């Protein structure tokens, strides 16, 4: 575990993270996809061998010795708000299990279901709060990756509010 487990946020490509493992915002079929998933496919293509897994689950595949945790958030275009919320919470719980099992001291994580799976809504708070619910009981350093400047500020504020 980390000496003083922390949350941080960075605005940059998760494919250039400085952590001991990465969470992919995967699709259920293990396809290259777009957004975070396409950057992850370009950086760690070996990790997409038998990475297909259902919505609300996470499946880890090693790229060399570097773990890629494929976490499948719901597409809110297809799910009801209620069922979507349940599956998004579940995906983050399965990430916490994998991070714990791997014995890593740090993990890079995107906000699941906030991009093309958002069903055109702002889900920063919803997705971040499910991330916290899952990860608060782990002792890995968590580094949240985003691309938008206003998102960076809102995620930073939410982290510092608890401190
Ligand atoms: Cl970058
Ligand atoms: Cl997404
Ligand atoms: Cl973002």
117: annotated binding-site residue? yes
Ligand 3 centroid, distance to 144 Cα (angstroms):
10
Residue 114 lies in domain: 1-163
Between CA 45 and CA 63 the distance in angstroms is 8
d(CA 123, CA 129): 10
Ion ligand 2: residues, CB within 5 A, are 115, 117
DSSP string, 20-57: S-EEEE--TT----STHHHHHHHH-GGGGTT----TT-
**Which numbered ligand comes closest to the C-alpha of 27?**
2
Backbone angles phi, psi at 86, to 5 degrees: -65, -45
Helix-helix angle 81-102:124-135, to 10 degrees = 40
104 marked among binding-site residues: no
The reply, when asked if residue 41 is annotated as ligand binding, is: no
Listed residues: CB within 5 A of ion ligand 1: 12-13
What are the E-state strand segments in the chain?
7-11, 22-25, 58-63, 66-71, 106-110, 141-146
- How far, in Å, is the centroid of ligand 2 from the Cα of 141? 23
User: Total domain count for the chain?
Assistant: 1
What is the distance in A from the centroid of ligand 1 to the CA of 72? Answer: 23
Taking the C-alpha atoms of residue 80 and residue 86, their distance in angstroms, rounded to an integer, is 10
**How many residues does the structure list for the chain?**
163
Ligand nearest to the CA of 77: 2
């Amino acid at each position: 575990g980390a000496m003083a487990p922390s949350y941080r946020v960075k605005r940059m490509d998760i494919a250039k993270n400085d952590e001991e493992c990465v969470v992919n915002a995967a699709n259920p079929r293990g396809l290259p996809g777009d957004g975070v998933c396409k950057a992850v496919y370009k950086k760690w293509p070996e990790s997409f061998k038998n990475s297909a897994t259902p919505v609300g689950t996470a499946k880890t595949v090693m790229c060399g010795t570097y773990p890629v945790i494929h976490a499948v958030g719901p597409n809110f275009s297809n799910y009801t708000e209620s069922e979507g919320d349940r599956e998004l919470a579940a995906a983050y719980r399965e990430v916490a299990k994998e991070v714990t099992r791997l014995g890593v001291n740090s993990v890079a994580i995107p906000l699941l279901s906030t991009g093309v799976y958002s069903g055109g809504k702002d889900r920063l708070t919803q997705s971040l709060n499910h991330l916290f619910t899952a990860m608060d009981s782990t002792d890995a350093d968590v580094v949240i990756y985003c691309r938008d400047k206003e998102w960076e500020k809102k995620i930073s504020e939410a982290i510092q509010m608890r401190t």
